[PDB]
DNA sequence: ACGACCAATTGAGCGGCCTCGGCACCGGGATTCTCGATCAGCGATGCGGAAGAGAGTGAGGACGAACGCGCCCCCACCCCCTTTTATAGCCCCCCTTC
């Protein structure tokens, strides 16, 4: 068995020890960065402050609807737009990731950038990746879970 | 001189049974509302079953081809033009007679 992320939220990961066997190896990612085999990634967490009228509803609504409201707010939106503009003018390739399609669409449309999600046909899907990779005028793509679940993204 | 004691008086306060049942506390009662599982959700995968896009070929189109006939040309070559004379009948135009 091979995998990049030998972790799952269920208590079934331990079954791999009898379904396949013990961990034959597990790379030290920091060592690989020190050796240059892996890119040095300066991870960060942007604490976007929620907007007051959003928090008012967010705190009021306790149902699953709050996932959308915490996902869509001016500050998070402005922060992404700012980081994108900055890195785009910095000539950096940027990949945007999201789960909820509603937020993904409303963000990508307002940012006039091409998104990618499940029902997007393989031809349309790959055509966007080729443009992003090669066309200098495009430098970011908005991908749903399709990008992280299983894919070969540039 | 008065202060306590004694007596007769008495009835409010007290010690108690009575009883009880409103309320609260206490504990123990089938419970209106808890939690702990099932099923539902969002967005993804894949499989399995469904449609449309390209094909064929009926066929008739346009028209390239292949032939003969056709008109027409450029081409050898051949004959006629012109001259002379003998010779004659034959012929027409003209003159001439009636």
Swiss-Prot record:
Protein localization: Nucleus
Question: Anything further noted?
Answer: The TFIIH core complex from patient XP11BE (a patient with XP/CS who has a C-terminal splice-site frameshift from residue 741 in this protein) reconstitutes in vitro transcription about 30% less well than wild-type but does not restore NER in vitro or in vivo. The XP11BE TFIIH complex has all the subunits in the same stoichiometry as wild-type. Purified mutant protein has very weak 3'-5' helicase and ATPase activities. In another paper the mutant protein has wild-type 3'-5' helicase activity. The mutation is recessive to wild-type. Conventional DNA helicases unwind DNA by binding to a ssDNA overhang of dsDNA and then translocating on this strand with cycles of ATP binding and hydrolysis to 'unzip' the dsDNA. XPB/ERCC3 is believed to be an unconventional DNA helicase principally because it translocates in a 3'-5' direction along dsDNA instead of ssDNA, thus it is referred to as a DNA translocase.
Associated clinical condition? Xeroderma pigmentosum complementation group B: An autosomal recessive pigmentary skin disorder characterized by solar hypersensitivity of the skin, high predisposition for developing cancers on areas exposed to sunlight and, in some cases, neurological abnormalities. The skin develops marked freckling and other pigmentation abnormalities. Some XP-B patients present features of Cockayne syndrome, including cachectic dwarfism, pigmentary retinopathy, ataxia, decreased nerve conduction velocities.
Q: How does it assemble?
A: Component of the 7-subunit TFIIH core complex composed of XPB/ERCC3, XPD/ERCC2, GTF2H1, GTF2H2, GTF2H3, GTF2H4 and GTF2H5, which is active in NER. The core complex associates with the 3-subunit CDK-activating kinase (CAK) module composed of CCNH/cyclin H, CDK7 and MNAT1 to form the 10-subunit holoenzyme (holo-TFIIH) active in transcription. Interacts with PUF60. Interacts with ATF7IP. Interacts with KAT2A; leading to KAT2A recruitment to promoters and acetylation of histones.
Q: Please give the function described in this protein's UniProt entry.
A: ATP-dependent 3'-5' DNA helicase/translocase. Binds dsDNA rather than ssDNA, unzipping it in a translocase rather than classical helicase activity. Component of the general transcription and DNA repair factor IIH (TFIIH) core complex. When complexed to CDK-activating kinase (CAK), involved in RNA transcription by RNA polymerase II. The ATPase activity of XPB/ERCC3, but not its helicase activity, is required for DNA opening; it may wrap around the damaged DNA wedging it open, causing localized melting that allows XPD/ERCC2 helicase to anchor.
Membership in a protein family: Belongs to the helicase family. RAD25/XPB subfamily.
What name does UniProt use for this protein? General transcription and DNA repair factor IIH helicase/translocase subunit XPB
Species whose genome carries this gene: Homo sapiens
């Amino acid at each position: 068995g091979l995998t990049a992320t030998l972790v799952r939220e269920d208590d079934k990961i331990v079954d791999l020890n009898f379904l396949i066997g013990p961990k034959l190896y597990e790379a030290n990612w920091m060592e690989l960065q020190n050796n240059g085999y892996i890119a040095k990634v300066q991870c960060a967490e942007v604490w976007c402050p929620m907007s007051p009228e959003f928090y008012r509803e967010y705190v009021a609504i306790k149902t699953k609807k709050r996932i959308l409201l915490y996902t869509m707010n001016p500050n998070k939106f402005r922060a992404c737009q700012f980081l994108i503009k900055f890195h785009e003018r910095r000539n950096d390739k940027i990949i945007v990731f999201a789960d909820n399609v509603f937020a993904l669409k409303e963000y990508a449309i307002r940012l006039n950038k091409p998104y990618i999600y499940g029902p997007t046909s393989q031809g349309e899907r790959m055509q966007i990746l080729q443009n992003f990779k090669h066309n200098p005028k495009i430098n970011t793509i908005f991908i749903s879970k399709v990008g992280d679940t299983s894919f070969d993204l540039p």
